[PDB]
Amino acid sequence: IPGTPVIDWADRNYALVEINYEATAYENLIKPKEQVDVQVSWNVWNGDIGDIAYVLFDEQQVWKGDAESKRATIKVLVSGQFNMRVKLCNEDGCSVSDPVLVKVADTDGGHLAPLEYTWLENNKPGRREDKIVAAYFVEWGVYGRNFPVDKVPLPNLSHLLYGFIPICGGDGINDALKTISGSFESLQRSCKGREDFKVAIHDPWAAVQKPQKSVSAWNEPYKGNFGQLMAAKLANPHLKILPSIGGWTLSDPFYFMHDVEKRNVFVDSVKEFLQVWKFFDGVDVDWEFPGGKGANPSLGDAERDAKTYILLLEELRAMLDDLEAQTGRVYELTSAISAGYDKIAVVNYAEAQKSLGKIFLMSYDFKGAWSNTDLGYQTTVYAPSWNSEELYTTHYAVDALLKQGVDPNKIIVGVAMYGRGWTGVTNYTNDNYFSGTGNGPVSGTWEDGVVDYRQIQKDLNNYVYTFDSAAQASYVFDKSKGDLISFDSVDSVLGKVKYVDRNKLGGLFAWEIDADNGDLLNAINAQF
Ligand SMILES: CC(=S)N[C@H]1[C@H](O[C@@H]2[C@H](O)[C@H]3N[C@@H](C)S[C@H]3O[C@@H]2CO)O[C@H](CO)[C@@H](O)[C@@H]1O
Ligand SMILES: CC(=O)N[C@@H]1[C@@H](O)[C@H](O)[C@@H](CO)O[C@H]1O
Ligand SMILES: CC(=O)N[C@@H]1[C@@H](O)[C@H](O)[C@@H](CO)O[C@H]1O
Ligand SMILES: CC(=O)N[C@@H]1[C@@H](O)[C@H](O)[C@@H](CO)O[C@H]1O
Ligand SMILES: [Cl-]
């Protein structure tokens, strides 16, 4: 037999998409690869080098050539781990080297181990399987909120909506980000060298760079939120993850997509974003809002956005159909819309529903601390008891879609895992505190005027709970400091379940998943 081969030592951790953990811009953050080249070299002891040389990736041939070269380069196209051996053969016999393990990494998670969700707080099995149970995961939730992916109750979720995927752009294209200090500049340095109207990542640190659970290794190819979501889909194979493009602050570049086809600069970037990051399962368009009303009041055009919103979905659906035939997968195209009738009337969803698979009806933020005069329910199914035709309700918004011809199976009702409130509510009659006028926003968890549902339960004995069984809404009041907060309790959410049940609505989605302590998500998945 030929000499025993000894594979020389080298790093055999390969990645089909390299990640530069020192970069800030998106174009220098990632390095997608056509292929990866597994290199192997060896030396020969105990005899000659043999006549022919083989390389084995499971005791099955993957390479052959000259044994004099003592080197082999193997093209690998798919991720995975395998043992590589060098097998020198000749007329006598064959010698087999000691195996080494090679790792080929890719965003499909083939190199990762399942990241199972350990049940925290009050979350308990199981999941509502015949209805859509979605939730929004915030990208910035790993900082002060301290809520990484390993805390997300994925076993009780059918969709995990990652918000938000930004659109590159400077002055005039993302002025809404200037409302938040440092948020606009973070997008500029993330789009360095990348020019406008292309998708990117707002913060590459928390997304793919920040060390987290099950992705804390020093040579970890993918960390952050993206790395955990790869391993999470293995522990939760039912789970489907969608990238949310836009949001409240990142919706400004949508208004400009009436032009030539910066849409293509958008869509073609979306098509590469989904094959670079394979753990996503479609696209979610969160244009807020078609026809103005957004974070930037300067933008808006009634029947320009109404057609642009249609053309955007038609071309995205056609682009996803190409991915479906090229990858063999199914890709979804969803969109979150406002629950305001004055805003639903702008877009004709009878035409949009043939490109959208589901519609996330944002049935919240009806009332807020932005107006001390217009006090009311932030989220509710029906009209309040003290005002029996508020048109900003979940019921009126659902019927508004139905009148247009929207299928009820495609309608997803929004659950608010938080609460907006006012402080120092004064000048009111009776014991109804919504007829009065507040004096400023209530003290909030992370932002004043908004309180997470979890903190509401902690401070529950500082308020007086009240459920409006006519409107299917809840609120709390504290006469000491005049704190009146409207939110979604277990009662109101359970009322939303039956409104979804045999009005034949698709399901429920919530914002945001980190603010729940297990009560709200369990009520969504209640089997009746
Ligand atoms: C108090 C909070 S959480 N405000 C964040 C805000 O608005 C979100 C969200 O962007 C908007 N899009 C749908 C998915 S839900 C709908 O309402 C939510 C809260 O009202 O979004 C911006 C970023 O766009 C955050 O900076 C705010 O903290
Ligand atoms: C970046 C890295 O992890 N490099 C190598 C790895 O390829 C190898 O599998 C391991 C043990 O052989 O030793 C590491 O130093
Ligand atoms: C990307 C991921 O994590 N898992 C996908 C899965 O969603 C898909 O159904 C399947 C079909 O090819 O391919 C896997 O790689
Ligand atoms: C400064 C501020 O809080 N603005 C809020 C925003 O947070 C919220 O997402 C949106 C809902 O439509 O309503 C705006 O008025
Ligand atoms: Cl390579």
Side-chain angles (χ1 to χ4, degrees):
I1 68 167
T4 169
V6 177
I7 303 182
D8 306 335
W9 183 91
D11 165 58
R12 289 167 177 87
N13 294 32
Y14 295 112
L16 288 158
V17 180
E18 295 187 21
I19 299 299
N20 176 342
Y21 285 89
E22 296 90 357
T24 40
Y26 183 83
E27 292 204 329
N28 306 329
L29 169 69
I30 63 174
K31 188 184 195 176
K33 288 190 190 290
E34 54 289 357
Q35 65 198 40
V36 70
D37 293 288
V38 173
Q39 289 175 337
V40 47
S41 316
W42 67 96
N43 297 323
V44 185
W45 309 79
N46 178 17
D48 60 274
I49 58 176
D51 297 338
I52 195 163
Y54 305 101
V55 176
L56 301 185
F57 287 179
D58 280 331
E59 303 170 60
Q60 297 282 5
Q61 199 195 86
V62 303
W63 185 90
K64 67 162 181 293
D66 311 359
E68 298 79 4
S69 52
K70 300 182 179 183
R71 188 192 192 171
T73 302
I74 304 97
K75 181 183 65 182
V76 174
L77 266 47
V78 290
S79 47
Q81 298 176 338
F82 46 82
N83 295 332
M84 173 176 60
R85 292 172 129 169
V86 179
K87 186 172 175 183
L88 307 182
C89 288
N90 63 359
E91 194 275 321
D92 321 282
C94 295
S95 63
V96 187
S97 68
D98 281 334
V100 297
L101 173 138
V102 185
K103 307 185 198 179
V104 183
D106 195 12
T107 61
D108 51 22
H111 69 285
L112 293 182
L115 175 54
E116 301 180 77
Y117 171 72
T118 71
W119 297 95
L120 308 178
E121 308 186 82
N122 303 332
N123 292 275
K124 32 178 169 63
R127 187 185 70 261
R128 181 72 180 266
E129 295 196 356
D130 59 326
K131 302 292 184 182
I132 300 300
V133 184
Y136 270 96
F137 178 82
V138 289
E139 174 170 280
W140 59 98
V142 299
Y143 297 114
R145 287 177 168 80
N146 193 36
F147 202 96
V149 182
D150 55 85
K151 292 185 173 183
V152 181
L154 299 175
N156 297 343
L157 295 179
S158 64
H159 295 79
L160 197 276
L161 303 182
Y162 181 89
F164 289 107
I165 297 304
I167 304 301
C168 286
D171 291 326
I173 317 179
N174 283 286
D175 299 341
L177 282 75
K178 301 177 173 176
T179 62
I180 305 178
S181 94
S183 178
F184 172 82
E185 296 74 11
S186 191
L187 181 60
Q188 300 310 308
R189 60 187 178 99
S190 295
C191 301
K192 206 59 178 186
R194 196 191 198 80
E195 292 239 3
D196 303 329
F197 294 94
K198 267 176 179 179
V199 305
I201 300 179
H202 199 187
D203 184 21
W205 172 254
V208 79
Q209 296 183 344
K210 184 177 190 65
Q212 298 287 1
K213 182 162 309 182
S214 69
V215 280
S216 187
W218 60 275
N219 57 339
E220 198 57 55
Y222 309 112
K223 311 179 188 171
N225 304 334
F226 281 2
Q228 285 186 314
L229 290 169
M230 305 173 191
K233 289 192 60 179
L234 306 176
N236 306 274
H238 73 273
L239 175 74
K240 317 182 305 309
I241 304 182
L242 295 177
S244 285
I245 308 180
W248 177 253
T249 60
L250 296 166
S251 295
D252 283 28
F254 281 134
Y255 301 88
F256 298 101
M257 295 193 188
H258 58 282
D259 191 6
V260 310
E261 200 131 30
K262 322 201 215 179
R263 205 149 64 244
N264 259 333
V265 184
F266 167 75
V267 172
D268 302 6
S269 63
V270 177
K271 112 161 199 171
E272 179 143 50
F273 193 93
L274 294 185
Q275 52 201 358
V276 164
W277 312 102
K278 301 175 181 173
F279 61 92
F280 291 118
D281 300 289
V283 191
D284 184 37
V285 182
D286 302 82
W287 188 356
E288 299 181 16
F289 306 93
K293 329 153 212 86
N296 196 347
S298 303
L299 313 172
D301 193 8
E303 292 178 351
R304 202 190 334 175
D305 298 339
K307 186 62 192 307
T308 304
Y309 186 84
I310 296 301
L311 293 175
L312 188 54
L313 301 177
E314 292 179 346
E315 299 161 2
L316 282 179
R317 183 69 264 175
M319 175 274 308
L320 293 179
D321 296 336
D322 297 303
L323 275 179
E324 290 184 355
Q326 159 181 346
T327 69
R329 304 170 50 184
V330 311
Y331 280 88
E332 295 174 23
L333 176 55
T334 68
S335 173
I337 70 167
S338 186
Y341 69 96
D342 59 326
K343 323 171 180 172
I344 300 182
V346 178
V347 178
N348 168 37
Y349 301 92
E351 185 79 7
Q353 74 172 348
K354 200 144 277 310
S355 301
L356 296 178
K358 287 170 273 302
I359 296 180
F360 296 114
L361 180 63
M362 291 180 301
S363 60
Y364 42 84
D365 296 334
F366 294 141
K367 306 293 187 307
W370 49 79
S371 176
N372 294 344
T373 61
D374 183 16
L375 305 190
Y377 295 165
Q378 152 204 317
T379 171
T380 171
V381 184
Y382 301 105
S385 300
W386 39 268
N387 181 284
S388 161
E389 204 187 4
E390 181 63 52
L391 300 152
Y392 266 15
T393 67
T394 305
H395 179 75
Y396 192 78
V398 165
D399 278 75
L401 293 174
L402 296 178
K403 163 96 168 72
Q404 300 192 14
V406 173
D407 299 348
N409 273 14
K410 308 175 95 296
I411 301 177
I412 308 300
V413 170
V415 178
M417 289 181 167
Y418 60 97
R420 279 187 163 81
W422 308 257
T423 183
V425 175
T426 44
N427 303 329
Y428 64 91
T429 63
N430 196 25
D431 65 339
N432 174 29
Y433 323 98
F434 305 96
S435 53
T437 62
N439 188 239
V442 73
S443 77
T445 314
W446 320 106
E447 175 175 68
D448 276 3
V450 179
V451 178
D452 294 312
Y453 170 80
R454 170 168 44 232
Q455 178 190 25
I456 293 179
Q457 296 304 321
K458 315 194 341 202
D459 306 336
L460 186 54
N461 298 334
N462 303 334
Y463 308 108
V464 170
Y465 178 83
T466 302
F467 180 63
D468 190 333
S469 59
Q472 300 277 42
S474 304
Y475 62 95
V476 289
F477 187 77
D478 180 22
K479 329 189 70 138
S480 67
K481 336 285 185 178
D483 294 324
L484 169 66
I485 299 171
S486 169
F487 68 98
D488 259 341
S489 66
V490 183
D491 299 326
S492 57
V493 171
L494 279 166
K496 297 188 173 184
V497 176
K498 315 209 221 186
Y499 189 82
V500 165
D501 281 347
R502 300 242 134 197
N503 296 98
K504 293 322 289 167
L505 297 184
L508 302 87
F509 82 100
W511 172 286
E512 45 193 61
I513 195 53
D514 60 87
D516 183 28
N517 72 336
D519 299 330
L520 302 185
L521 182 57
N522 292 1
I524 297 178
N525 295 272
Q527 324 181 60
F528 285 176

